[PDB]
Assembly symmetry: D2
Homo-oligomer: 345 residues x 4
């Protein structure tokens, strides 16, 4: 089968031919119908040799949608042909966090060597993929697979981050979204669907600001040195109830601390090496909590799928072939994918 | 009347003789029965002239209990003789936060120049004090005033910090308490009363470790370079569900980040200028939130008083006269008060 | 001044001339700009002499908006001319419930004879009204008073009822609204604004079904014997996550129990003498909780006003003069006010 | 193997000899070390033929602990020898409720015919039992099996009921526990461990009131006509924040409604044919929610075990042989087991 793999430290992903896999006991083989590119793939491929821990080669792609092709021995709950999305942050399934479907916060996964598809286990950017267990599949019914693939991360991660502090986001609240890319442009729509928050979007690029308005942002602000003041002008000196930073650079985190309200929240979702919020007296308002959330929970993925089926999400995508896999990643690096890049095998 | 005041930037507090205040409309005059010393007083008195903002002179004492002595015009809801504790973090009373009793997170107080007694307004460390409004008094009934004064902050503050994440502290959880002083020793007892968390205490002083055990900590380990390893030995690789740092030095925050669990919590309660948690990827576990909480809410103060009335709080105190005020603050600076220092005018 | 009063048991309200009131200490005098009619007014007037406890005469009107006309001694926080809404369920202001702004659940108000305007205290259906304390006024800025008056109950009450179980109403959830009248037509709109719930409206009146669709209901079905089956056809055998019954007749409550989901919720909001949910095994699904909520909290009222200011609420009203007061109550009785009747003095 | 089975409508259970089961794919065979008797078993056996739905014969016992004796094909996560407690309310594992581990509220189980061991599937009152899947096993380590068995229901069910409203039970709150039997005597101890509530116990029998005090009730009161007054005598006319009714007869539910506080909670846990709370205006206080909860969640069972391991639970048991099975049910019917009856095969 055809797949797109990271094969050498510091090199670009390449199209390879590798054996179509066979599902073992408990496992499920999907024919992949759509595979999303995530900016985290770029972070991974940029890691120095001394830090990269996912193994080589690695079939990329941790946003996966497909149809069930073959059932491993003993698998129940799905039949051949079923359209499903892959729950990515695999956990042990048995610890206290896993018991609540919070497998993203599994306390055993690291020790047991359990890794996500595309991030340690073979990913979805191939004609076929293996899923470890039936509980990491979620039915999507007749959802267009291309729009559905981003739901597994671009949808799921912001959904989780927002969900952590949803009770803060009542009428009169303001939510700031920094970074209107794959995650950001979906995060705006989630905010509008599950809360009455006023949504202020922030990006370096005017066209991304335009995208922000297209998907529902009430306001759009240019990132950089003037952004904090501009956000405050919109909120009055009260500041923003919550800031969801899908960039996570030191500059954006700094902006977030300068606009967040007393008893508010900063979610640092974007990943930038060494960048960090500075949480201490006189450096952040009283009671404004900060967190680096990770991916999302099982029930949350189901909720994201429900938003999509209700027509509440307009996922902006561009489609590529598998052969275009490497070219798509160059486009992602350069910031020319207006939304989510999705490979259709 | 006799009072203890901060009078000169960089000097020691001095016992003075100022006029006895008279309650204006809405105000209540208390005969002060007990005034707690707080380590925050030391921070305030150590601020450079360029940073000190509370005005000179200042009557110290933001932990106050007393008996209703005189009602200002219009005041209803209390009678002369009523024993009361004073709610410290005064708010505008009208904003969204205040409307929920969360006056500590009032978004108007700073602009309106509303300040706490002993931290901008005349404090409790005098024979008498003024309270601005009935809603800032809470009934204590027949509670011993000496052990009651500390409830207003030594109790309230850790109680609020713990309350922010109470749902995390189920059976099986671990709470670490760094700093077993005024706040810490009460924080331990709160944890034991409102949760099933296992409580691990940390301090530099072995006698304070003993105190931690006396008030019900399950374990108590020396602070410093070996603390994180010792803590982890006790919890196993899982780490602590929540860390309540009542020291807030960089070293103690660092320890906090080194032991906190995935999806856990760090509460930086102690105040050390420039000290801050570093919240970013690869520097703290996924999902581990961090906050600097501030004082507490009105209903929380009521709840702390209810804990004390139910005999759940063994508050350790040393009693001083007003004249001993300055000396008591020296005792606190050097760390020789086993618990809370309390002045009885 | 002119006012509409209930003056004798079993009779209709009448237009009377009574003295314009003078604000005492702490009180505020409003020039009333809008007074809403509530169906609870009909319940009150329909009570037998032996049950009616609100005293006679009684100036009706517990939905009130006005401008501050006169300040009582020592009142602060408002100036003459300020546009305000009246928070109705007055509480003691000092109990644990009140300290959280939940004055609707005040545990002292009964004992202290603290009653709401229009429901024991003189109401808003008059040229002027007295408000007991500044904490019972909420600023409405430039909101049109006619549309604003219903926010104080028709908005507040459903808002509170929904807010009790907001975390249940995630994507994929369903909320049934029974009764598309004053409260119901606003409750529909609150659901769409603060949740991703699908909204199914239920009413006896075909024109009210149309109103439900006009204000955002995803579906509307005829009430009565066939309604449960029809609701279930819409939701599949899962049933409705939550049912908000703004009628509260035995028949509508029976419908609610027949459609509510496992671990769902029934909020019996509407008031019908003797009607009640029957909560017992085999009579209702496991975990489906039931409550009769009352009015709403202070912070909730602020949140309702914020919804209105953000253009999230389209309140359907019909305007009457004071002289038309009694005629308007007759219209309310016959069910010919499409939304909320509002008197403009 | 020997087992205790319900074999004939209206008859007592009998000791039988039936084949030892063999684990199918995914299933686990346990050697049973302890099997708890529950009063629900009596309710089941008292069901008329027309209502009884669990099939005959039925091996009784929905409280089970044992050691892993054999793994079915492809089972992972447990080894032969492992000591485990059985999670009883089996769900589909894949719906939105199950994804959160709330299998007790699975919306698919009825339609799929998924039934609990002892309540439709073969129970634990036998030398060996089958568990359908690994996710329904929780490790107990070296916990004594006799005292562990009750954790799976007598512990889990009260734990879940209390957990639904735990935020209500702060310092100053009162929890009433009606019925100090298998569940009740554990419920009292859970309240003391996970909250600061004052616990008032109610029972018909003085010796059960003695039991209540032995396990930490703050007060004990005779059930019946005088109970409501006696509870209010203890709580002051304020009422009880929460009432956990482990009897659930019309009379005890009536008592609960007569004592519950405004904005409080009644949990109808006990099962008595036809009895129900009557939730309507003037029949119950404002905001006081009522629910019939069912069993408990996966993470809750883990928490219960964690309480036991930390020594927070003193489970009163009497031990029986399998041969004494029927005799023990006679003892339970007459109310002469002082706590929980446990069969040790
Ligand atoms: N925490 C998690 O569990 C997790 C999950 C998924 C993605 N991520 C991270 O989230 C981030 C976003 O991922 P993506 O795939 O949506 O990225 P993307 O490449 O699709 O979009 C990046 C967007 O951010 C904007 N941007 C860059 N710098 C900015 C700045 N200084 N200020 C404002 N906007 C700026 C760009 O213009 C672009 O619109 C990445 O860092 C990724 O690694 C984290
Ligand atoms: N966030 C808030 O609203 C707020 C409110 C009250 C107090 N505080 C702060 O809390 C802190 C504690 O106040 P307090 O009155 O309890 O002080 P305290 O003087 O009574 O007690 C200090 C304790 O901390 C211990 N300690 C100091 N350094 C330590 C370290 N490196 N490791 C372990 N233990 C150490 C000491 O041995 C002593 O037992 C102060 O910084 C105070 O300003 C903050
Ligand atoms: N619990 C509280 O705090 C609270 C607060 C305000 C109002 N209420 C109660 O809410 C109820 C509604 O008040 P309102 O002013 O909105 O009433 P309304 O007269 O404005 O509207 C009544 C609506 O209910 C519909 N209706 C009547 N019977 C019905 C039935 N059998 N099935 C379906 N629809 C039916 C009518 O067609 C009409 O559309 C009243 O009982 C009032 O007492 C309770
Ligand atoms: N909802 C659920 O998921 C679930 C789960 C387990 C048990 N239950 C039910 O809970 C109830 C208790 O079960 P158990 O096994 O603990 O019972 P048990 O037989 O062990 O104990 C019953 C206790 O209730 C007392 N009692 C009986 N009538 C009383 C009254 N009128 N007032 C006060 N006390 C009274 C008895 O004296 C005894 O102490 C049963 O009805 C059972 O079916 C429900
Ligand atoms: Zn990603
Ligand atoms: Zn796990
Ligand atoms: Zn202090
Ligand atoms: Zn305020
Ligand atoms: Zn009303
Ligand atoms: Zn009150
Ligand atoms: Zn049972
Ligand atoms: Zn299920």
């Amino acid at each position: 089968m055809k797949a797109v793999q990271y094969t050498e430290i510091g090199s670009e992903p390449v199209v390879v031919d590798i054996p179509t896999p066979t599902p073992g006991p408990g496992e499920i083989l999907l024919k992949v119908t759509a595979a999303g590119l995530c900016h985290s793939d770029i972070f991974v491929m940029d890691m120095p040799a001394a830090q990269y821990a996912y193994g080589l080669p690695l079939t990329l792609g941790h946003e996966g949608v497909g149809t069930v092709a073959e059932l491993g021995e003993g698998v129940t709950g799905f039949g051949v042909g079923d359209a499903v999305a892959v729950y990515g942050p695999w956990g042990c399934g048995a610890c206290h966090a896993c018991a609540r479907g919070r497998e993203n916060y599994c306390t055993r996964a690291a020790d047991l060597g359990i890794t996500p598809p595309g991030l340690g286990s073979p990913g979805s950017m191939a004609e076929y993929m293996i899923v470890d267990s039936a509980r990491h599949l979620v039915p999507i019914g007749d959802l267009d697979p291309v729009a559905a693939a981003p739901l597994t991360d671009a949808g799921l991660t912001p959904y989780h981050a927002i969900s952590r502090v949803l009770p803060l986001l009542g009428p009169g609240s303001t939510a700031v979204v920094i970074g209107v890319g794959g995650l950001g442009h979906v995060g705006i729509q989630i905010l509008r669907a599950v809360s009455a928050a006023r949504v202020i979007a922030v990006d370096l690029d005017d066209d991304r600001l335009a995208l922000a308005r297209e998907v529902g942002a009430d306001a759009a602000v240019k990132s950089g040195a003037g952004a904090a003041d501009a956000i405050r002008e919109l909120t009055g000196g009260q500041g923003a109830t919550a800031v969801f930073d899908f960039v996570g650079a030191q500059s954006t985190i700094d902006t977030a601390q300068q606009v967040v309200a007393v008893d508010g929240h900063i979610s640092v979702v974007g990943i930038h090496a060494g960048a960090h919020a500075k949480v201490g007296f006189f450096m952040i308002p009283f009671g404004a909590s900060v967190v680096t959330p990770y991916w999302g929970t099982r029930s949350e993925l189901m909720e994201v799928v429900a938003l999509a089926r209700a027509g509440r999400l307009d996922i902006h995508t561009e489609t590529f072939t598998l052969d275009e896999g490497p070219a798509a990643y160059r486009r992602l690096r350069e910031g020319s994918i207006r939304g989510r890049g999705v490979v259709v095998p």
